Design a protein around this ligand. Sequence first.
Ligand SMILES: CCC(=O)N[C@H]1[C@H]([C@H](O)[C@H](O)CO)O[C@@](OCCn2cc(CN(Cc3cn(CCO[C@]4(C(=O)O)C[C@H](O)[C@@H](NC(=O)CC)[C@H]([C@H](O)[C@H](O)CO)O4)nn3)Cc3cn(CCO[C@]4(C(=O)O)C[C@H](O)[C@@H](NC(=O)CC)[C@H]([C@H](O)[C@H](O)CO)O4)nn3)nn2)(C(=O)O)C[C@@H]1O
Ligand SMILES: [Mg+2]
Ligand SMILES: [Mg+2]
Ligand SMILES: [Zn+2]
Ligand SMILES: [Zn+2]
Ligand SMILES: [Zn+2]
Lengths: 184, 183, 185
Amino acid sequence: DTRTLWTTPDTSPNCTIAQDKDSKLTLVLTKCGSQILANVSLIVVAGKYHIINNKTNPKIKSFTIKLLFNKNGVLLDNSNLGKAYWNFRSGNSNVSTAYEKAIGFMPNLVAYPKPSNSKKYARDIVYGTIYLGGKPDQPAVIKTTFNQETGCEYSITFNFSWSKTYENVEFETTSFTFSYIAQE
Amino acid sequence: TRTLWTTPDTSPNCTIAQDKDSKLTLVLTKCGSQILANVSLIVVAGKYHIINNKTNPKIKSFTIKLLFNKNGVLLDNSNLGKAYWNFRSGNSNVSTAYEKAIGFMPNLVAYPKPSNSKKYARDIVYGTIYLGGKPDQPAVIKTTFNQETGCEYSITFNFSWSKTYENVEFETTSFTFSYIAQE
Amino acid sequence: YDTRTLWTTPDTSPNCTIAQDKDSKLTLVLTKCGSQILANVSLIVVAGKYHIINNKTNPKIKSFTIKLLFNKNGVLLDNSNLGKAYWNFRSGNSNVSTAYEKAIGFMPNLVAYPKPSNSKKYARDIVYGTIYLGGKPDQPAVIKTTFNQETGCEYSITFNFSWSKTYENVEFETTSFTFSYIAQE
Ligand SMILES: CCC(=O)N[C@H]1[C@H]([C@H](O)[C@H](O)CO)O[C@@](OCCn2cc(CN(Cc3cn(CCO[C@]4(C(=O)O)C[C@H](O)[C@@H](NC(=O)CC)[C@H]([C@H](O)[C@H](O)CO)O4)nn3)Cc3cn(CCO[C@]4(C(=O)O)C[C@H](O)[C@@H](NC(=O)CC)[C@H]([C@H](O)[C@H](O)CO)O4)nn3)nn2)(C(=O)O)C[C@@H]1O
Ligand SMILES: [Mg+2]
Ligand SMILES: [Mg+2]
Ligand SMILES: [Zn+2]
Ligand SMILES: [Zn+2]
Ligand SMILES: [Zn+2]
């Protein structure tokens, strides 16, 4: 499937926030021509962000997952998402060898330029809210930013944050859909 | 081939509390591995038509279920009626009831059926729509994939609200979401 | 030449007139996924009345509207707030060289979203979202999008921006929002 990059939809940890493989990021990018249709959720399985307790830890209120890409749209190893887990769809799994090119899935650099001395516009951000444990009283903000990281040609970053004082709440989320303008 | 829908008319096609009390307008468009979904609801009669939470404070939510078999065919005991749920042709439907739509079904690995395994929240999408198009009349639309029994796939819409509405007609703005496709 | 996308281009060159000529860049991308249009929108105000919001100074400045009006062929009418010059089918990061003559497949569906009439008016022709000024999560503004409710046109898409906080010297430039709507054909 040449039109979807994804993480497979299983629950196998693939992401490192605070410690190795502490999370499963489920991310599906579907190319609808000039726009990428994106669907995301997160399951934290272990470590610092698995169970939030803001009584115990009042300043644990946010964290970031970064996807960094080179000029060919290939995932770079400083990304929180592991390289072995990210590929074009084949059935419910991934192609068995790493892809060489995915520029058509990258966030457009004219729409979303890299940091510079020029005025920075907010249109490179999408805000949404997801819900921990599927409970409507457990919001957390998912802030997605395009092309704002260094050490790469392109980037997608997910910042998760919350303003409520959660007491023993597992960090596993509902799903959110957004889109962005494609590089080509 | 590419869009399954209810048609865009306002003819009731859904039974929440009594027969044909509502029009669910639902459009599913297959963009490969994801289904792009667009939904709204008009209740025209019955218990959920005109909401008054001063006289009936406990009337705060209701559910509309779409149940599908192994071939993605809508089951008769869904709240949505089978008659006008089909692949699009113009502003109407193809003239033959579809036999297969597995590519429009919610992915079972992403969204497993109920079991004794852990239930993860990623099979839910939350949104908010607005009654009467008024920005001070929110209601929550909670969409859940593959959590019904007696089917192979399902999409469930739970509508709820926390405001104390006084004689407010339950007809909504539109909401867009997506989900991971079975194949 | 990308016939599946109508857009404004992704640059920041002003293309829109809210209160004075070319006071803003509306970035709007309509991508045809068959029976649905997948839409992505943001707004940058660069000058005039809506550039810098100060509701201490001007407590009544709380909202504005950007209208896109279309004829029977889906062509943008020149009384739209959006200018015709760079609304066109995509070619790379720019537009196709000549103005389009037909884009009916990008128009909002008139049965889903009928023009005003004696018949009951339903809310399903509206999409509500919230965007954030300056990308700050404590600076919400509501983006209300309405299909086919303007007169003097075959089809319309209108964006109403409003806020309910007392902003003091907040520049009106937004995060992005995605929605979809049912296409006419
Ligand atoms: C989808 C599921 C869901 O909605 N879950 C919510 C959950 C459930 O509804 C209930 O649990 C079910 O029973 O409720 C949650 O909250 C419950 C408590 N609660 C309190 C109030 C009274 N409010 C409380 C309040 C909180 N704030 C914080 C400041 O607000 C902002 C800000 O900084 O300006 C708003 C920003 O959007 C937000 N940013 C983001 O979310 C980023 C994505 C920020 C940030 O969260 C913080 O800054 C941290 O960075 O916070 N302020 N107040 C005071 C209050 C009262 N009202 C009444 C007016 O509300 C409406 C209305 O009904 O008229 C609500 C409409 O939705 C709104 N319409 C629109 O937005 C159209 C698009 C409408 C209009 O704006 C208005 O009429 C003008 O036209 O206003 N408003 N504020 N209420 N509930 C929970 O359990 O935690 C939240 C769950 O999300
Ligand atoms: Mg609770
Ligand atoms: Mg009111
Ligand atoms: Zn645990
Ligand atoms: Zn009614
Ligand atoms: Zn400025």
